Amino acid sequence: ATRFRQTRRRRGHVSMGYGRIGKHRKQRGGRGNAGGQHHRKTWFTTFHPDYFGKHGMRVFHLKANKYYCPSINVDSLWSLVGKDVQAQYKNAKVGEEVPVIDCVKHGYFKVLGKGFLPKQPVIVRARYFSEKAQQKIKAVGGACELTA
Amino acid sequence: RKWQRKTPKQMRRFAVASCIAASAVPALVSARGHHIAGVPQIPLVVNSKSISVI
Amino acid sequence: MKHNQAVSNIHFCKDWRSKVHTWFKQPFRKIRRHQTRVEKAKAVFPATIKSLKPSVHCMNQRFNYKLRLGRGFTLKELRAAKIDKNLARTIGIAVDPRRKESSKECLNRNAQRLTEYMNRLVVLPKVHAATAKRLVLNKKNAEAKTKKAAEIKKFIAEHNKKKTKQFNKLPVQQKEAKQVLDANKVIRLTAPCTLETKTLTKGMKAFDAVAHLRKAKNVAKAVSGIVKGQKK
Amino acid sequence: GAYKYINALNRKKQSDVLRFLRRIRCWELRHLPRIHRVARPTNPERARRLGYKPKSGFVIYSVRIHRGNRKVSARKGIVHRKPACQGIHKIKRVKSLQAIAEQRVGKHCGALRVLNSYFIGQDSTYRFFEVILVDPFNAAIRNDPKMNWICADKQKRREARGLTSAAKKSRGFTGKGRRYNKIGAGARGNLKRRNLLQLKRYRS
Amino acid sequence: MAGIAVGLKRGYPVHTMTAKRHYGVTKRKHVVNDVIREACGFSAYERHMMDLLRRGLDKKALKYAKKHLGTHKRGLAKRDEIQRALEAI
RNA sequence: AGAUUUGAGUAUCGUAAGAGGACUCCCUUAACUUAAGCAUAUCAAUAAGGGAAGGAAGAAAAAAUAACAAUGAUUUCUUAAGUAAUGGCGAAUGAAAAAGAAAAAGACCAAGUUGAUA
RNA sequence: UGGAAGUAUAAAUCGAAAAGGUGAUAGUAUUCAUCAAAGUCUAAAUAUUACAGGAAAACUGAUAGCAAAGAAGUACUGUGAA
RNA sequence: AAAGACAUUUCUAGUUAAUCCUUUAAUAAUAAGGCUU
């Protein structure tokens, strides 16, 4: 909407809100990120202090698929199967059927342990497990299963 | 130039629902400039057997 | 630049105005392709099938739990399904001798796909006239096949209570033709998945998943020390 | 057969026999015109491999080219350029001499189609190639199914568009994979596709 | 239940199945090699390499071969081939 | 004398040339400009010059990816991604596999073999 | 070239094979995996501001829209390119 | 020594070997690259 721009409220004002002393000239210190080490150094220090330099080792061809590992906390495990299934097997124990939460089927590979688990046995199947994730699962009466 | 615009689907469905609802209010329909003073019901529905012969 | 902003990285310093591609032909590609699809649906009528494709696993561990349509069945999958590789290309089956047999599970999964397709397949005679040899030979062996099918019915009756054909017969018969556009939409890649339930035992309860992960990791990093020690 | 020995024998180019024969041929080609026709290939085994057949419509033309490198064509070696583009010597041609020789023969015989070419010999000055040419309007060429692709309109002056083996190598078509990421289906066509700024009808 | 995603014994439990075909020559290819070698002889660098090998400088012969053939494996095979020619005489 | 090889003149039947070049495949070492100067860099397969094509062209059937529960000619689109990387490591430049789709199709020469050989 | 102890091309010299190439940190060794170069063709999906024939338009409406709504690349200028 | 479906991990002491991270199929000795100063 060009009728709501500031250009429609500065018609009649000579300089269009750019000043009479310091005009609206072509450049205001260079083009792009020019002068990052000479006259815009105070801007780069203030707002991007680690812009200039090197840090870390180069990876000549990065295989970003190897670092792909979605994670789910223990507190979010039961939401994969829903609260209806969770309440159905609320009084399960050793010996009878216990729901299996296949994280890989839902796109989660590693199970991290954060937050609390409802006090029901559960079988958690995933590729990797955190240390506290296995402790919290076992303390609730469940089991940890490996995949792939 | 950008000729066509985007709108989220659920916002379009929200707007359509609020437009079907407003068509069942005779005060809003008449205020839009429609002559509905003689219709029986403003949610006017006709039999499907009558439409089949038209 | 003034105040707090990101460092701008815009690659417009070249001539982008001659590099601009506009999609004003998008609404008409849909019409052009759909119309060409319909004319493709005729001419080759029935079965404008996009060829039966195998069930293959997506590459890399990021995707390997998913199945997707490959390109062409391997020669072993056709041999296992008892299909001639020369006839396969003419009855709407994709063939790919470039693909190597990856696993037994792949061989069995994609041999079952061909078996299901061959049962759902109806091949019309090469000559429409009723005096064609295949229609003639169908009547000729119809008497003999009745006794041939007698023991096969009881073959699957007592046991279920290498002599295996090199090639199965093509299903050739005269029928009212119904056109399905794609056979990959009839034969699913995988069955729908429901909630899995398992019996909780003390054996699974005591399993230490983290310890096995660390041991597998530590054993992998310990092969370096073995080689250095052996050379010492 | 007999051509399995000739192929094996042709790999011993430093042998006394092949050096002697190449010495006699190179002397002869120094006095004959630059582009001239030869009755039969002087390396028949290599010609057969590249597509030559002893049938009517297949001809062999010998081309002599000046090997080495030439200066940048600037008057008195003077260029009004920045020091980055101020070099005169040591700048090499992108196109090989074989591709350049094929294009000189093709322009000389514009009514024929350049099939392929191979290496005959060289001395301190010249390099000698032999170019296989096909007549697209011969009855024999047109009536066979395995060669009448050369009778297509798009095959006119093949080597000038970069379709022969020697001209295609200079285009970068010497392999496949990540080594040739910029020569996918044409280096210039690939570059344009990567530069396209796709502006959809509905964009955010 | 599935294996393990870490270690040498890594992967889902399946029955993985390809043959390693060898691209080689036949017995007749030795006849063609000797016929051509008889007719053509030895190159200038092969004759120089032979002189070093008859003097016992087998390391210098390899360094000479590597200089002309450009690969350590290629130079080693050429050194073996020239030696086999010397013992024939 | 005769048998070949190579090279010519003539006759007959044909072929190339020029126009056009928006899109297509290439050759050639521009500079203005940006870097708040400037010399590498950038502008930039960009301008101009030159060659060759068709209704499309180019490419196309692995001396290819990958390290997987593995894929499978080429092209084009989406995503990867302004990412890995390059760079007075400054200004700036900058992909590809995997994954999702449109469309799909594989065939020959050479070499080898058969020679009362055609 | 993004390709970084060399991604691709070319030139000078050199130059393989009882095959071998690649796994982008140079080197050598042993395994592993995957391909098998140095000849050719190949429809379809793709591009198009030449030109020709059509249809549209939140476009311009005679200083606007093409330079040109009339005998417009015309009248007129220049030795010529223009 | 204690838990483990018709294998394998844990704790304890003795030993021997390797040990700041990377060069992306696995290792090795050179080489190079990272981190702190």
UniProtKB/Swiss-Prot annotation, chain A:
Q: Which UniProt keywords apply?
A: Cytoplasm, Endoplasmic reticulum, Ribonucleoprotein, Ribosomal protein
PROSITE patterns in UniProt: RIBOSOMAL_L15 (PS00475)
InterPro entries for this protein:
Ribosomal_uL15, Ribosomal_uL15/eL18, Ribosomal_uL15/eL18_sf, Ribosomal_uL15_CS
Origin superkingdom = Eukaryota
Q: Where in the cell is it found?
A: Cytoplasm, Cytosol; Cytoplasm; Endoplasmic reticulum
What coarse category fits the chief subcellular location reported for this protein?
A: cytoplasm
Keyword Endoplasmic reticulum set for record? yes
Matching Gene3D superfamilies, A to Z? 3.100.10.10
Q: Does the keyword Ribosomal protein apply?
A: yes
Q: Which family does it belong to?
A: Belongs to the universal ribosomal protein uL15 family.
Function per UniProt: Component of the large ribosomal subunit. The ribosome is a large ribonucleoprotein complex responsible for the synthesis of proteins in the cell.
PANTHER family reported in the protein's UniProt record:
60S RIBOSOMAL PROTEIN L27A (PTHR11721), LARGE RIBOSOMAL SUBUNIT PROTEIN UL15 (PTHR11721:SF3)
Q: How does it assemble?
A: Component of the large ribosomal subunit.
Name this protein carries in UniProt: Large ribosomal subunit protein uL15A
From which organism does this entry originate?
A: Entamoeba histolytica (strain ATCC 30459 / HM-1:IMSS / ABRM)
